[PDB]
Amino acid sequence: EVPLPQLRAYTVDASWLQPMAPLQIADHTWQIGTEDLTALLVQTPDGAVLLDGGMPQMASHLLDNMKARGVTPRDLRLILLSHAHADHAGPVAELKRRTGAKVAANAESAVLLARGGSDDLHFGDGITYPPANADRIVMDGEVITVGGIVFTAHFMAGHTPGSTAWTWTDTRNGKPVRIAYADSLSAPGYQLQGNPRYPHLIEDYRRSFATVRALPCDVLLTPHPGASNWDYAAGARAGAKALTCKAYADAAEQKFDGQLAKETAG
Ligand SMILES: CCCc1ccc(Cc2sc(N)nc2C(=O)O)cc1
Ligand SMILES: [Zn+2]
Ligand SMILES: [Zn+2]
């Protein structure tokens, strides 16, 4: 009586995940994701690194744009992420099976990733996806370099205990551009206060706003493009009205404070 993959039935909005070929951001860094979800490929002589991937569908559309930008599965060396939620780490496992890639990630994003997003601090097992093992554990401020480009982890706990920001500089207009890929600072439906699964939640977000402000931030990009008023649907005017870390940050803190305000009502 009806298989296991026969149902199970996934609601899919045909408007999500509308693919898009590489949208260049700098000499070496491109946005190969989809239009509603960041996924930055940065190419290098030694290999290439991917920051975030999006949803689990996206693996083969990402792997496409990695060829449209001259990256073979073997040339994909390293995968970084922002946080280990299904819509940013979704395809990591598959890509690891299909590429030469390995994953670097902090201890708390590694655990969430390895249990596939299950037992989420706020969504339980609703948001469950294909688990992956991390190949390298990173410490706050640790630097990873690949063929000249230098990546720095900045922990910004909040959205996820393991929410990270990565920073690297590459050329572009010939001058350096200090690229801050900052994680979500959102808190959707989250019990903020007296949360037994995250007692320093308010404190952590608080320190993460400050962290994001201080980022070496010529160009901010966020995993949800619109979080920083990008619009990957405006050609070379994507980051035209792109926010700055200070702006992004003060924005989130302001909405956070408002969230908090309504929780402390009754
Ligand atoms: C009126 C605003 C509705 C809204 C807007 C943004 C979010 C945040 C979401 S969603 C999603 N799939 N990821 C995020 C994230 O924070 O990374 C949640 C809800
Ligand atoms: Zn998330
Ligand atoms: Zn998200």
CATH number at residue 37: 3.60.15.10
Cβ neighbours of 77 (radius 10 Å): 18
CA distance 22 to 31: 6
Angle, CA 258 vertex, CA 255 and CA 264 arms, to 5°: 145
The answer to the question of residue 115 being in a domain is: yes
Determine if residue 98 is left, alpha or beta; phi over 0 gives left, psi from -120 to 50 gives alpha, anything else beta: alpha
The answer to the question of residue 7 being in a domain is: no
Kindly give the pairing relationship between strand 177-181 and strand 143-146. unpaired
- Residue 139, C-beta contacts closer than 8 angstroms, at least 6 positions apart: 106, 153
The answer to the question of residue 3 being in a domain is: no
Task: Give the position of tokens 């037992």.
Answer: 119
Interval between CA 160 and ligand 2 midpoint (Å): 7
Among 38, 193, 197, CA closest to 123:
197
- Residue 265, C-beta contacts closer than 8 angstroms, at least 6 positions apart: none
Angle, CA 33 vertex, CA 30 and CA 39 arms, to 5°: 65
The answer to the question of residue 168 being in a domain is: yes
Interval between CA 189 and ligand 1 midpoint (Å): 10
Question: Residue 265 phi/psi, 5° resolution?
Answer: -95, -100
Kindly state if the Cβ of 109 falls inside 6 Å of ligand 1: no
The number of domains in the chain is 1
Experimental technique: X-ray
The order of strands in the sheet holding 164-170 is 143-146, 149-155, 164-170, 177-181, 219-221
Among 260, 246, 89, CA closest to 182:
246
Q: How many angstroms separate the most distant Cα atoms in the chain?
A: 63
In sequence order, what E strands does the chain have?
23-24, 29-31, 40-43, 48-51, 76-80, 102-106, 136-138, 143-146, 149-155, 164-170, 177-181, 219-221
Q: Resolution of this PDB entry, in A?
A: 2.4
Distances (CA, A) of 52 to 39, 149, 183: 5, 17, 10
CA distance 60 to 66: 10
The answer to the question of residue 5 being in a domain is: no
Interval between CA 85 and ligand 2 midpoint (Å): 5
- Residue 71, C-beta contacts closer than 8 angstroms, at least 6 positions apart: 41, 43, 48
CA distance 138 to 92: 17
Q: Which domain holds residue 155?
A: 23-263
CA distance 71 to 73: 7
The answer to the question of residue 13 being in a domain is: no
Which amino acids are annotated as binding site, given as ranges?
Answer: 83, 85, 87-88, 159, 183, 224
The answer to the question of residue 9 being in a domain is: no
User: Ligand 1, closest atom to CA 186?
Assistant: 16
Angle, CA 95 vertex, CA 32 and CA 20 arms, to 5°: 20
The answer to the question of residue 10 being in a domain is: no
